[PDB]
Design an enzyme around this catalytic site. Structure first.
Site, short mmCIF file in Angstrom:
data_model
loop_
_atom_site.label_atom_id
_atom_site.label_comp_id
_atom_site.label_asym_id
_atom_site.label_seq_id
_atom_site.Cartn_x
_atom_site.Cartn_y
_atom_site.Cartn_z
N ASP A 175 1.05 -1.10 0.00
CA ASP A 175 0.00 0.09 0.13
C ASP A 175 0.97 1.22 0.07
O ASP A 175 2.03 1.02 0.30
CB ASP A 175 -0.64 0.22 1.30
CG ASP A 175 -1.60 -1.05 1.56
OD1 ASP A 175 -1.31 -2.25 2.03
OD2 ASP A 175 -2.95 -1.20 1.25
N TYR A 210 2.73 4.80 1.12
CA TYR A 210 2.88 5.19 2.32
C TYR A 210 1.89 6.16 3.06
O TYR A 210 1.25 6.90 2.17
CB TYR A 210 4.05 6.51 2.26
CG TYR A 210 5.44 5.75 2.03
CD1 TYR A 210 6.26 4.83 3.06
CD2 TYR A 210 6.05 6.14 0.77
CE1 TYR A 210 7.48 4.65 2.73
CE2 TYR A 210 7.52 5.85 0.79
CZ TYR A 210 7.89 4.83 1.77
OH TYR A 210 9.24 4.32 1.36
N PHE A 264 7.69 2.62 -2.66
CA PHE A 264 8.77 2.82 -1.64
C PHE A 264 9.38 4.40 -1.63
O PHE A 264 10.25 4.86 -0.93
CB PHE A 264 9.87 1.79 -1.68
CG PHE A 264 9.06 0.52 -1.07
CD1 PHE A 264 8.87 0.33 0.22
CD2 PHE A 264 8.91 -0.38 -2.16
CE1 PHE A 264 8.07 -0.89 0.56
CE2 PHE A 264 8.35 -1.72 -1.77
CZ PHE A 264 7.93 -1.96 -0.37
N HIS A 280 10.23 -8.38 4.35
CA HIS A 280 9.97 -7.10 3.92
C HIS A 280 11.09 -5.86 4.77
O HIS A 280 11.17 -5.88 5.71
CB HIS A 280 8.72 -6.67 4.40
CG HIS A 280 8.22 -5.54 3.71
ND1 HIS A 280 8.25 -4.34 4.16
CD2 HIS A 280 6.96 -5.26 2.60
CE1 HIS A 280 7.58 -3.25 3.64
NE2 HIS A 280 6.95 -4.06 2.50
CL LIG Z 1 4.50 4.03 -1.81
#
Ligand SMILES: [Cl-]
Ligand SMILES: [Cl-]
Ligand SMILES: [Cl-]
Length: 232
Positions: free
Chosen positions: A73, A75, A86, A196
């Site tokens: 998902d 941030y 990311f 992760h």
């Molecule tokens: Cl993101």
């Protein structure tokens, strides 16, 4: 082009030409997501990332994708997500801790200096698909748009990549990403699995995983071009 366009306009006007064809099976689902977002705004709620960035991962050429990185998902902190899993905007400091972890391992694996900022656009420009499975989130409400319809969209994307004969490496971070293995196994795709990079899991095996160099070794073995991972 933002939410308005996502609800109202063809894929051809939203994403790169190859992606538009690849996502054709989910054209109605994409439109429905645009309506979902419109309903959120009408209700006095917000969502992230910016509307113009929601589909950004599909604005680089489908035919040049050689590595798939899956996130879950976007941030949830306002101002961080920019439509590439990311990644953050260049002015963002400190980096989210997941990104700082990714960059820790980048330095350890590849020996490059720590990146100047958190913008991963160069990876997307060089054949990395930075795909979140869920492409929007309500601010400060992690995973709040799970189960709202993005999953079918992003699965269609991944299946189109995997269906190709062209070489693909998939970097699969955490148990949820590892759910993708069956669709990936029937193709010309090798998966690199680890925990992760979130601080919640990184120290159980993300560090030491060397995904960058491994992905390149795999690509070169398959006769594909490696990725130039180097960030400024
Ligand atoms: Cl993101
Ligand atoms: Cl609208
Ligand atoms: Cl809100």
């Amino acid at each position: 082009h933002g939410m308005a366009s996502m609800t109202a306009r063809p894929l051809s006007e939203l994403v790169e030409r190859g992606w538009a064809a690849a996502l054709e099976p989910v054209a109605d689902q994409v439109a429905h997501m645009g309506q979902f977002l419109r309903a959120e705004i009408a209700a006095g709620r917000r969502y992230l990332p910016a509307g113009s960035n929601v589909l950004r991962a599909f604005t680089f050429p489908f035919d040049n994708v050689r590595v798939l990185i899956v996130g879950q998902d976007p941030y949830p902190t306002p101002g961080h997500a920019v439509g590439l899993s990311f990644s953050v905007a260049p002015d963002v400091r400190p980096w989210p801790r997941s990104l700082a972890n990714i960059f820790d391992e980048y330095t350890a694996d590849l020996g490059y200096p720590l990146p100047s900022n958190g913008d991963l656009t160069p990876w997307a420009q060089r054949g990395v698909l930075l795909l979140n499975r869920v492409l929007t989130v309500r601010p400060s409400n992690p995973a709040s748009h799970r189960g709202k319809g993005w999953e079918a969209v992003t699965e269609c994307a991944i299946r189109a990549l995997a269906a190709r004969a062209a070489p693909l490496v998939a970097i699969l971070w955490g148990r949820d990403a590892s759910t993708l293995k069956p669709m990936l196994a029937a193709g010309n795709c090798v998966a690199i699995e680890s925990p992760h990079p979130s601080p919640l899991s990184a120290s159980r095996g993300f560090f030491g995983s060397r995904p960058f160099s491994r992905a390149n070794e795999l690509l070169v073995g398959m006769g594909a071009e490696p990725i130039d991972w180097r960030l400024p």
